[PDB]
Amino acid sequence: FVGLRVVAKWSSNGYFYSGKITRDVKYKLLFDDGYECDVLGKDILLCDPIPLDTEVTALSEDEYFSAGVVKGHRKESGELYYSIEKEGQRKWYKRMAVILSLEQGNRLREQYGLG
Amino acid sequence: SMLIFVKTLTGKYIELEVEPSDTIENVKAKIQDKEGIPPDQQRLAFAGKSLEDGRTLSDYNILKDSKRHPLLRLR
């Protein structure tokens, strides 16, 4: 799974954050936030991009994270932007501004969970 | 309780549970507890506003409803 993009959490009740598998050891993860970390495969979702209609948490321009739904994807300069709708309004977010709550990630484990 | 996020200068995100009655000092202590950064070296800001010692989060109108989780940044 090395080189693969992933969303993964590093604490028992934490959020899932986007990153890359750098080595299999547990898996050595480089999060897009720059933190490097060995996390259980149990806590890794191998989906990239996060699919359409997934409920995510996204950082708005006003510096609040809040829930929304993925409605689209755009890959420009290699960077991925998500179109995310919140109460009917769509904006574009950088990959590193889109995370999953524990419940939001839990809903993807059966289909995308590593293992 | 209410959820907030803190972004370190390393770029790493931290998650904290807080009460609107929490002071900036309490928050920095939680950051210390989770990351090992001294209170004295933490310059917390929200949306570019410096958060000053001995105020609460509610003093800065940071905390809205439970659905919205503010991102504080260290500078």
Numbering used by the authors:
A (entry chain A): 1486 to 1510, 1514 to 1603
B (entry chain B): 0 to 74
What does the paper say about this structure?
We then iterated on the sequences of two top hits from these libraries (L67R and L67H) by varying the amino acids T12 and T14 simultaneously, which revealed changes that could further increase the HDR-based readout. Taking this data altogether, we chose four i53 protein variants that represent the sequence diversity observed among top performing hits (L67H, L67R, T12V.T14H.L67H, T12Y.T14E.L67R) to further characterize as protein-based HDR enhancers in HSPCs. We observed that the L67R change enables a new 2.8 Å H-bond with D1550 of 53BP1, and that L67H forms a network of inter- and intramolecular H-bonds, including a water mediated H-bond to S1554 of 53BP1 and an H-bond to D64 on i53. For the T12Y.T14E.L67R structure, T14E forms a 2.6 Å H-bond to Y1502 and a 2.9 Å H-bond to the backbone amide of Y1500. The T12Y mutation forms additional Van der Waals contacts at the protein-protein interface. These analyses demonstrate that each amino acid change in the variants selected from our screen form stabilizing interactions at the 53BP1 interface, resulting in tighter binding and validating the use of this screening approach to identify gain of function protein variants.Fig. 2 i53 variants display additional molecular interactions with 53BP1.
An alternative way to improve HDR editing rates is through downregulation or inhibition of key factors involved in competing NHEJ and MMEJ pathways, such as 53BP1 and DNAPKcs (NHEJ) or DNA polymerase theta (MMEJ). In this study, we leverage this functional screening system to assess focused libraries targeting the protein-protein interface of i53, an engineered ubiquitin derivative, and its binding target, 53BP1.
